[PDB]
Design a binder for this molecule. Structure first.
Ligand SMILES: Nc1ncnc2c1ncn2[C@@H]1O[C@H](COP(=O)(O)OP(=O)(O)OP(=O)(O)O)[C@@H](O)[C@H]1O
Ligand SMILES: Nc1nc2c(ncn2[C@@H]2O[C@H](COP(=O)(O)OP(=O)(O)O)[C@@H](O)[C@H]2O)c(=O)[nH]1
Length: 1795
């Protein structure tokens, strides 16, 4: 008890002599005498002059929370410490500082005059909250303790509320601690992710809360702008009325303002933050409850709080729940429900009281288990039901009483049921769409449709039907597929309006000719899978001139008659899979409209499908054969041998080259292409000329031969019998490669030696070489090969007879017909071969396109790519259409040259120094040709020379080789094909991005690679020879770990993508004999992990069939091996591990169709995977596993929030799992739900699709097909995170199996013309059209279905019409410009995908409703709207371009600008006075002369110029002053000195009315310039009007009650900003004032009359106009001044600058929201209005001036009225959050790739 005196002494001397373990003892004396004797606890004062200091401060102030003014001594200390050690704050917040600073600022300090104190504590708090992290804990540690006041302060200071753990965060926490509703309301209204709010439901659903739930639903599912509740995807276990209560709107709800407390502290702290930083009705309709698993809805069927808002529902969805027994009481409560659907529920009986509903249509109960009979009560009458869906129930009879119950029914759908019996007359008077598919119907009563005279779309698929009852004469569409028919019944032939007919999969025999159909409107005739013999069209064919689809596939057709050219409109012919056609008629060339034409599984009179022949050229080709076609006699005769034979010395005698002047010739280099004609001097004048290719035999050129071994050729082969019976063996490889490359070509063995001896070699050729896997040897001779002889002459004869009988697939190749346009093209190239630089005979397409000009060739740019290819197969010129090899401009004429150059490199050796290993070589060699040289060799892959490369293999010693860590897979084949290794080791070589760009150091000899990253990941594609085996194997050993399972599954692909691309006859099932298949890809497995002494072979074909289970095991079934280990590619184990199917959780029913709901009659089903809803895609027999594995590799690494993402993929069966687009594709939406798109969902869809293209075009992959059918919506809630998602499977099937031209309607001009390769600018034109169908809500497609040939051509040139003038839709004039950019003809003039999104991300395009270009050179400076008529509105303008005034009426929907002179002096302002009587609303006009004129709304002739004033009228107004217990109003003419004349609303008619109270306020030197009225109506609409520089006010008294003056302002930086005239003033909780040429607004106050805020403009403009505006450095005399003010109700303040900008200031919390520039030049007038029940718009009358004649001291002004959606300040910040959440998802999705 002496320490008090000790500290009292120290406090004295610590001051005067500047005292310097003082702080130590004065600290421990606290801990020694704590919680007592506050006098010694005042020692804190000395601390103002080891973190123990922290722990001793927060513990002192807290324990004395409200003791005395020791807090003032505490905080002073804490403030003194902070300003010198700013780091100290990290220690305070670390302790209990939160516990003590939250109490002070909230211990009822408001309402208490301790302003001196609070300013201290806020100053102290201003520094604790400096660090970005500290706010995030100052906030989090203010939510645990329920503190609404402070949690609001820390939000206005930043401190994001979505940061805690991401998976878990504040809202999940705040909902666990049973917080206050006011606390949740602040996190949601601030930054708060959707994925965290949704998790807060299930947390807050478990517990029963009525105010914490109803605040989460309001943010998750309530589209107030569209009157909807989108509670679909949520798995809310049960719905209760107490939750949906506060969602429905209430008109009585109006609140006070109490959060201003937290708003004051928000700015006080911000003030001290800167000062320390600067110096140093409308009942909602849609209610969706889809996915919520509700086992009962009874909770709504009571008289609860919402039973008065449900009576205006008009739509209710309960599909995919588990409901049953729709409650009787409810269906009588919602007496306005007009769209009810409840399908996939577990019903078991039709309620039959649902029809008692008042006004119902589109009742949809269509997947439940409704019992046998569904009899409707015969005493209920529902004349409003239009569509009665009952599909996929369990009905066994048609519903009973449709006629007596639902009279006006339109679409009775009954598919999927089990309807069995012969039906009943079904006397429905207004059916339009029947449906009876998938039932078991045997036959219909002959009077079935005898009472429904309006049917249009009867459809009975998959039944057992044979005859048709009378069909009414009104049928249009009629589908009868999968039935059991015999002949098209005579009742269908006589339908005089039929317009489509699907009769697939029936067994009909005779398709009647067009003279039997009695209806000229045939459009489609699907007849696939029938048994149709003839296609009789000769009797009369023009009757089908409109047919647009004639599907005849899978029929027994024999020929296509020539009259099929009469079907001029035929758009999609389909005659595939006929197997007996053999010919297309040359008349088919007249089908100019065909865009697809399948050729699958039928052999024609030409060789198609090279890379082209895309069903459009085939029509051109067949058309050129109609002008003049001539036979083409030209074949290839390949000569083949091996380093010593009669190849080049037998040919010289075959051609009978008489000279052979070279006494001694040399071995061949290259292949020596030559041609000799054969003029067979016989009866047949066919002078065939076949070109010989005497291949070189030396084993070093073999790497290049497979390029020139085509399939249209007759191969020779030469023994060299001198080495009898030993050379025939050495010739098997050649015969094998002939079999590998060209299986269907003949072979003529030619024993070349007789002169020198052994001729029993005909035995082995007949024994082993004849018919064993080798090609079809058609002869064998034994010529002499050095002199003409009888033995040789009979060989020359066999070459002829074997050529003229080539006949591949019964075609006789040597004598086919081709268009003379080709033969003439052949003659000019040969005639040009003599006129080309021998050093480089190559020709560029430029030179080629001129050769046709010199002659009269009728070929176009679409013909040459086919023409010049048909000349390639014939060996006239070489040309390669590969896109990767960038030489397709080079056209190799004189093939014998290129074929010689490619072999000069393989012979150039160096007998100098072997400084390099064998096989590698650098560029050691004319004019730029050497550069062109290996710009072709590298293109030809021969560059490092993969041939002649270190045959001897190096002894590799693999790290882990213990028989259980390695995976092996042999490829036993009889001989390595010719160009196998040099091709293989050059396909795996260039793949460095394995394990994806880390290149592995590799060592590749001639027949191996062995590229290894580490002893844990390698791949050795070797080649060894087994023991006692003459085959040739390809062993591939890979480590069995995860990084190794990838390499195997990635090499086996390349080695197979090569085998079928190059040697397709290796993997060819030879059904003759047995299925040897010539290539047996074994796999190796061993049960003993190590020391197995052998690895047992196991064919892959047999093992792949063992996919029924997952384990393999021997005949001793104790132990077993997982197939993953031995062949991890058949099982999808190489792809990312997250996509293993894991069948234990996938619940999926393939067989049923009621779960196949996706689309219509498709293949992708619906299922559940990990408890969530997904969409599995069952694959048919088409897609082989090798391709499915080829597609998944590209789908697995897209990972975008705007691309359908995979979830799993597996076998049993080959299925593919993806996300379930809940609301289905987009095309189905705008086809039947056109009211759901609401001008802000039309945008988020276009933004999410332009976000997908922003990523696809980033990964260098073009979509190539973007249509309203490929966009899969996910929810119809506008302010959601994932709405649209473009289906990404389409590109996978293309990038693997390469609709490549795109759907006709949704197609670019560069892709339809087909003459130019595509670009990324094709997906933009296709997207530009997608914006045209979203804008017009699918109006082009609906009309495009009955004009399909004009559906494509109209848009294929940019000639499609205006989206507004044609189709009725709201303008949206900032996207009609984005269309007119993405719809340009030039490809590189359309905005790239990154730009088409950066101008969709703008939040100003989505609000600007319609820009209205005023007539040229009209100067208007005043406007007024008409709000008493809400049917439609008009804007009465003024005029300035004349000194004599004139009003300018202007509509809004017709935009008819009208001129009517009404005065003789320029007009300055107007006002609109309405009278509740007589139904009129006059307009008043203030002009410079003072003539106050008034004219009627209708009559433009009844006018009376009221009592003229003295100065120029400047401001008028119409008020709300009804103070006589009834309706009454005045008008306030603002003269230019203050003679405010007040009037009456009904007295305006009389000429010269009575100015009630002329209140001369100021002087002639004080002109009035504005007027206003209060924001609230509680204070009796106190008026606040400006005058000169003196602001005033009044009330019902009409006397000045305030005379605030602004020039006397004591905050002078500049003076005349306040010493100038006023312009406008708006009334709120404060006052905002505008002066002439003032770039600042002045925030005065009502009571205090002080400058509470000063907001300069350029403080915002100069912060964005820094880099994007560089020239402004000379513009220090800035332009842009406040011209007008407009204050939204409580949200933002619209400031119109003298420039082109417009300011959005959130008057509550944050100042700058956005500055909307570059849309005008001078925002001169701005005000609000309401338009046609789409109220609350913000008219903005800007200017526009172009200095066309600025040198003539004149400017051309164009006033540009606009209309902004008043919800703009929300949208601009609601969108900037919408992009943040998607950026946060676009990155986290990129992490699932690496993780
Ligand atoms: N993930 C998904 N979620 C929801 N619906 C889907 C999904 N994927 C596809 N669908 C719908 O399923 C239907 C079938 O789509 P599919 O891809 O089979 O069409 P398609 O490719 O034209 O058919 P086909 O290949 O037989 O021509 C489509 O109408 C589509 O809208
Ligand atoms: N004595 C003889 N020599 C032949 C016969 N046929 C070809 N030759 C020789 O084969 C050589 C032709 O080279 P060739 O083996 O065709 O070269 P490759 O095309 O590279 O295999 C000539 O020099 C001839 O001497 C023949 O019937 N009798």
């Amino acid at each position: 008890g002496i320490q008090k005196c000790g500290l009292k002494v120290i406090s004295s001397i610590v001051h005067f002599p500047d005292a310097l373990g003082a702080m130590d003892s004065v600290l421990h004396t606290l801990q020694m005498y704590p919680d007592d004797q506050e006098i010694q606890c005042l020692g804190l004062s000395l601390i103002g002059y080891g973190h123990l200091l922290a722990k001793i401060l927060v513990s002192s102030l807290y324990r004395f929370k409200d003791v005395a003014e020791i807090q003032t001594k505490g905080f002073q200390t804490i403030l003194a410490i902070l300003k010198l050690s700013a780091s100290f704050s990290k220690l305070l917040v670390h302790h209990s500082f939160d516990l003590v600073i939250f109490h002070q600022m909230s211990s009822n300090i408001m309402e208490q005059k301790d302003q001196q104190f609070l300013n201290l504590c806020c100053k102290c708090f201003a520094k604790v909250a400096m660090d970005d992290y500290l706010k995030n804990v100052m906030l989090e540690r203010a939510c645990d303790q329920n503190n609404s006041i402070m949690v609001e302060c820390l939000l206005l200071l930043g401190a994001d509320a979505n940061q805690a753990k991401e998976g878990s965060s504040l809202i999940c926490q705040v909902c666990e601690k049973e917080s206050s509703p006011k606390l949740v309301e602040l996190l949601l209204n601030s930054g708060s992710r959707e994925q965290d709010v949704r998790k807060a439901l299930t947390i807050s659903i478990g517990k029963g809360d009525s105010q914490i739930i109803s605040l989460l639903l309001r943010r998750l599912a309530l589209d107030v702008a569209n009157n909807s509740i989108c509670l679909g995807g949520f798995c809310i276990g049960k719905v209760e009325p107490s939750w949906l209560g506060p969602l429905f709107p209430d008109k009585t709800s109006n609140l006070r303002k109490q959060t201003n407390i937290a708003s004051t502290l928000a700015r006080m702290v911000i003030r001290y933050q800167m000062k320390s930083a600067v110096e140093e009705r409308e009942y909602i309709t849609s209610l969706d409850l889809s996915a919520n698993e509700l086992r009962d809805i009874d909770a709504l069927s009571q008289k609860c709080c919402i039973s008065v808002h449900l009576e205006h529902l008009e739509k209710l969805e309960l599909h995919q729940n588990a409901l049953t027994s729709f409650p009787q009481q409810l269906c009588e409560t919602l007496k306005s429900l007009t769209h009810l659907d409840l399908h996939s529920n577990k019903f078991t009986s039709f309620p039959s009281y649902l029809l008692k509903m008042s006004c119902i249509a589109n009742l949809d109960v269509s997947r439940n288990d409704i019992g046998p009979s569904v009899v409707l009560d015969p005493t209920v009458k529902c004349p409003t039901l239009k569509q009665f869906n009952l599909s996929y129930n369990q009905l066994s009879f048609v519903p009973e009483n449709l006629t007596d119950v639902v009279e006006k029914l339109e679409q009775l759908i009954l598919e999927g049921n089990k309807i069995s019996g012969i039906c009943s007359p079904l006397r429905l008077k207004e059916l339009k769409i029947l449906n009876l598919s998938k039932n078991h119907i045997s036959s219909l009563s002959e009077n079935f449709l005898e009472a429904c005279p309006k049917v249009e779309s009867f459809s009975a698929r998959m039944n057992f039907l044979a005859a048709m009852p009378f069909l009414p004469p009104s049928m249009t569409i009629l589908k009868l597929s999968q039935n059991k028919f015999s002949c098209i019944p005579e009742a269908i032939l006589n339908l005089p309006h039929l317009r489509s007919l699907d009769m697939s999969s029936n067994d009909i025999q005779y398709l009647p000719g067009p003279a039997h159909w009695k209806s000229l409107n045939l459009r489609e005739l699907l007849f696939s899978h029938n048994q149709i013999s003839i296609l009789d069209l000769s009797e009369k064919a023009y009757l089908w001139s409109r047919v647009e689809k004639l599907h005849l596939s899978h029929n027994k057709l024999k020929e296509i008659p020539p009259e099929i050219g009469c079907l001029e409109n035929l758009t999609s012919l389909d005659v595939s899979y006929n197997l007996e056609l053999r010919s297309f008629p040359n008349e088919m060339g007249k089908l100019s409209k065909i865009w697809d034409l399948p050729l699958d599984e039928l052999h024609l009179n030409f060789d198609f499908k090279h890379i082209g022949c895309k069903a459009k050229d085939i029509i051109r080709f067949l058309q050129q054969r109609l002008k003049k076609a001539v036979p083409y006699n030209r074949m290839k005769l390949m000569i083949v041998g091996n380093t010593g034979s009669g190849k080049t010395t037998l040919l010289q005698q075959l051609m009978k080259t008489k000279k052979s002047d070279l006494g001694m010739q040399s071995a061949t280099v290259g292949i020596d292409v030559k041609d000799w004609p054969i003029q067979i001097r016989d009866k047949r004048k066919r002078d065939l000329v076949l070109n010989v290719w005497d291949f070189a035999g030396r084993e070093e050129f073999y790497s290049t031969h497979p390029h020139f071994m085509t399939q249209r050729a007759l191969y020779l082969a030469v023994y060299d019998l001198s080495k009898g019976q030993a050379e025939v063996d050495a010739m098997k490889p050649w015969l094998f490669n002939i079999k590998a490359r060209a299986s269907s070509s003949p072979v003529i063995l030619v024993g070349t030696h007789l002169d020198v001896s052994k001729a029993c070699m005909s035995k082995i050729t007949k024994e082993l070489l004849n018919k064993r896997g080798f090609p079809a040897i058609r002869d064998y001779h034994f010529v002499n090969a050095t002199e003409e002889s009888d033995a040789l002459a009979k060989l020359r004869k066999t070459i002829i007879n074997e050529s003229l009988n080539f006949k591949i697939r019964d075609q006789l190749v040597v004598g086919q017909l081709i268009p003379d346009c080709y033969v003439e093209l052949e003659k000019i190239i040969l005639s040009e071969r003599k006129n080309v630089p021998i050093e480089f005979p190559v020709i560029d397409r430029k030179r080629l396109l001129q050769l046709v000009r010199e002659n009269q060739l009728q070929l176009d740019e679409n013909e040459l790519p086919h023409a010049v290819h048909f000349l390639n197969e014939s060996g006239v010129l070489l040309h390669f259409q590969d896109p990767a090899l960038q030489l397709s401009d080079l056209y190799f004429v004189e093939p014998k040259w290129l074929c010689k150059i490619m072999a000069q490199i393989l012979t150039v050796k160096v007998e100098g120094c072997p400084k390099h290993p064998k096989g590698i070589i650098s560029r050691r060699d004319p004019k730029n040709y050497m550069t062109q040289y290996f710009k072709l060799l590298e293109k030809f892959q021969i560059a490092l020379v993969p041939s002649s490369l270190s045959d001897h293999r190096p002894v590799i010693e693999l790290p882990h080789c213990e028989n259980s860590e390695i995976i092996i897979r042999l490829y036993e084949m009889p001989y390595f094909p010719m160009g196998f290794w040099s091709r293989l080791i050059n396909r795996l070589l260039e793949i460095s991005p394995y394990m994806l760009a880390l290149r592995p150091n590799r060592m590749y000899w001639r027949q191996g690679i062995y590229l290894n990253w580490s002893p844990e990941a390698y791949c050795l594609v070797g080649s060894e020879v087994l023991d006692n085996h003459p085959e040739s194997f390809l062993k591939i050993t890979v480590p069995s770990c995860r990084k190794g399972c990838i390499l195997l599954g990635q090499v086996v692909d390349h080695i197979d993508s090569l085998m079928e691309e190059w040697f397709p006859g290796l993997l060819e099932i030879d059904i003759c004999g047995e299925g040897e298949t010539l290539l047996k890809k074994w796999a190796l497995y061993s049960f003993n992990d190590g020391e197995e002494h052998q690895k047992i072979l196991l064919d892959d074909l047999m093992k792949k069939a063992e996919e029924g289970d997952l384990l393999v095991n021997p005949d001793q079934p104790r132990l077993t091996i997982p197939i993953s280990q031995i062949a991890p590619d058949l099982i999808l184990a190489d792809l990312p591990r997250n996509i293993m199917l894991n069948n234990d959780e996938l619940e999926f029913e393939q067989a049923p169709e009621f779960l196949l709901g996706d689309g219509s009659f498709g293949s992708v089903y619906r299922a559940a995977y990990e408890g969530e809803e997904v969409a599995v895609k069952i694959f048919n027999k088409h897609t082989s596993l090798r391709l499915l594995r080829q597609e998944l590799v590209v789908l697995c690494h897209l990972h975008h929030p705007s691309l359908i993402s995979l979830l799993a993929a597996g076998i049993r069966p080959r299925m593919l799992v993806m996300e379930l687009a809940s609301k289905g594709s987009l095309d189905r939406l705008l086809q039947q739900d056109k009211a759901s798109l609401t001008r802000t969902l039309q945008h988020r869809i276009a933004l999410h699709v332009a976000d997908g293209l922003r990523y696809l075009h980033s990964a260098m992959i073009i979509y190539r097909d973007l249509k309203p059918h490929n966009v899969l919506l996910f929810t119809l809630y506008p302010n959601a995170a994932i709405i649209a998602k473009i289906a990404d499977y389409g590109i996978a099937q293309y990038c693997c199996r390469m609709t490549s031209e795109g759907t006709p309607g949704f197609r670019a001009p560069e892709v339809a013309r087909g003459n130019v390769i595509y670009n990324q600018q094709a997906d933009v034109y296709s997207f530009g059209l997608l914006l045209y169908d979203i804008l017009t809500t699918g109006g082009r497609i609906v009309e495009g279905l009955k004009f399909p040939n004009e559906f494509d051509e109209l848009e294929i040139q940019g000639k499609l019409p205006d989206p507004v003038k044609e189709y009725g839709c709201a303008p949206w004039p900032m996207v009609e410009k984005l269309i007119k950019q993405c719809l340009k003809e030039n490809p590189q003039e359309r905005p790239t995908s990154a730009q088409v999104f950066d101008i969709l991300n703008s939040a100003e395009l989505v609000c600007l409703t319609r820009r209205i270009l005023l007539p040229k050179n009209v100067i208007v400076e005043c406007m007024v709207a008409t709000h008493h008529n809400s049917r439609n509105a008009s804007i009465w303008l003024g005029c300035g371009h004349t000194d004599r005034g004139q009003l300018s009426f202007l509509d809004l929907n017709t935009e008819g600008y009208t001129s009517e002179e009404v005065a003789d002096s320029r007009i300055l302002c107007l006002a609109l006075v309405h009278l509740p009587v007589e139904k009129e609303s006059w307009i008043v006009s203030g002009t410079q002369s003072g003539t106050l004129l008034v004219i009627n709304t209708e009559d433009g002739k009844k006018r009376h110029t009221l009592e003229k004033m003295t100065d120029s009228v400047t401001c008028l107004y119409c008020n709300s002053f009804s103070k006589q217990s009834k309706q009454k109003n005045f008008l306030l003419v603002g003269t230019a000195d203050g003679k405010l004349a007040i009037f009456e609303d009904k007295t305006v008619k009389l000429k010269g009315a009575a100015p009630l109270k002329i209140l001369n306020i100021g002087n002639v030197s004080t002109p009035l310039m504005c007027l206003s009225e209060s924001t609230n109506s509680t204070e009796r609409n106190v008026m606040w009007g400006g005058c000169g520089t003196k602001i005033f006010s009044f009330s019902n008294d009409f006397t000045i009650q305030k005379l605030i003056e602004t020039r006397t302002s004591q905050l002078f930086s500049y003076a005349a900003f306040s010493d100038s005239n006023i312009i406008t003033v708006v009334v709120d909780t404060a006052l905002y004032i505008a002066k002439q040429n003032s770039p600042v607004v002045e925030v005065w106050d009502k009571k205090t009359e002080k400058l509470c805020g000063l907001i300069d403009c350029v403080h915002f403009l100069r912060e964005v106009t820094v880099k994007e505006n560089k020239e402004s450095k000379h513009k220090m005399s800035y332009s842009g001044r406040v011209k007008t003010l407009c204050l939204q109700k409580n949200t933002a303040l619209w400031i119109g600058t003298g420039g082109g900008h417009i300011l959005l200031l959130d008057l509550s919390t944050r100042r700058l929201i956005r500055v909307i520039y570059n849309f005008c030049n001078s925002v001169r007038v701005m005000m609000t209005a309401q338009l046609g029940s789409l109220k609350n718009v913000m008219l903005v009358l800007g200017y526009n001036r172009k200095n066309t004649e600025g040198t003539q001291k004149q400017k051309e002004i164009q006033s540009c009225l606009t209309v902004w959606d008043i919800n703009l300040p929300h949208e601009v910040q609601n969108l900037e959050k919408h992009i943040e959440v998607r950026k946060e998802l676009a990155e986290k999705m990129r992490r699932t790739s690496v993780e």
